[PDB]
Amino acid sequence: PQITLWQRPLVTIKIGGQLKEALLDTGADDTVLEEMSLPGRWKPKMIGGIGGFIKVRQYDQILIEICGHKAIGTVLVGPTPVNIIGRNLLTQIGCTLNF
Amino acid sequence: PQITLWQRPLVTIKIGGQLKEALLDTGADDTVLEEMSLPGRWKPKMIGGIGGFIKVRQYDQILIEICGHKAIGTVLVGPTPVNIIGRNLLTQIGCTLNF
Numbered sequence: 001p002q003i004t005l006w007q008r009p010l011v012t013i014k015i016g017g018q019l020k021e022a023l024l025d026t027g028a029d030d031t032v033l034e035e036m037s038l039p040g041r042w043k044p045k046m047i048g049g050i051g052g053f054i055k056v057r058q059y060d061q062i063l064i065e066i067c068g069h070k071a072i073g074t075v076l077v078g079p080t081p082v083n084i085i086g087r088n089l090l091t092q093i094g095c096t097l098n099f
Numbered sequence: 100p101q102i103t104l105w106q107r108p109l110v111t112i113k114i115g116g117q118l119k120e121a122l123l124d125t126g127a128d129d130t131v132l133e134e135m136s137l138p139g140r141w142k143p144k145m146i147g148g149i150g151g152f153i154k155v156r157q158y159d160q161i162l163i164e165i166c167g168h169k170a171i172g173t174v175l176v177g178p179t180p181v182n183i184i185g186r187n188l189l190t191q192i193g194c195t196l197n198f
């Protein structure tokens with residue numbers, strides 16, 4: 001689909017049997033999601049941006065269905081204000097920026 | 100042009116006769132530039148990122164050329180990791196997400 005930027009580009013993603021809404025973020029290297037339990041073991045990690053850094057848990061090789069498109073990748077779980085889909089997963093669904 | 104997200108979507112912007120590197124950020128509602136001198140007065144604004152809120156200086160009606168596309172809009176100046184081009188300026192140059 002062709003998403004415009006008049007409003008925030010939120011899409012419905014499905015992960016772990018839960019349907020969540022997330023932002024398609026081209027400025028985000030990683031994919032950060034709000035606190036939830038994911039199977040598998042995790043690795044502690046610090047990610048930052050404007051406002052500073054936050055501690056998250058890095059779960060590898062998780063499956064996320066972004067608007068029907070399946071994607072596999074690293075997912076960081078932590079105290080983020082909004083679920084964000086980064087470049088790692090955006091590339092897998094063939095997302096591009098045009099202008 | 101079409102931009103894939105395998106790498107960071109950095110473009111060259113021209114602001115105040117100076118060239119700068121900037122990130123095409125669809126997850127950014129606003130355009131936040133690094134510390135520089137801009138013309139006119141400024142108003143205060145609180146913007147929240149991943150690590151929290153910060154204070155920035157709001158300058159209105161600033162000319163900024165993004166990849167040869169001129170845009171006149173609101174630019175915020177404050178403590179940011181990199182120059183960020185947000186939805187406010189992306190909509191002006193006609194930027195969309197496709198997939």
Ligand SMILES: C[C@H]1CC[C@@H](O)[C@H]1NC(=O)[C@H](Cc1ccccc1)C[C@H](O)CN1CCN(C(=O)c2cnc(N3CCN(C)CC3)c(Cl)n2)C[C@H]1C(=O)NC(C)(C)C
Nearest residue numbers: 027028029030047048049126127128146147148149180181
């Ligand atoms: C624009 C602001 C105004 C108000 C909101 O609209 C707001 N938007 C945002 O802040 C959104 C989130 C949001 C959305 C809605 C509501 C609230 C928040 C995130 C933003 O789109 C992207 N953001 C760009 C700058 N940036 C970097 O350049 C960067 C890159 N690399 C670094 N590193 C670490 C490793 N090193 C090796 C090399 C340097 C460091 Cl420290 N920093 C951090 C990055 C970010 O946050 N990435 C994630 C993985 C943490 C998500």
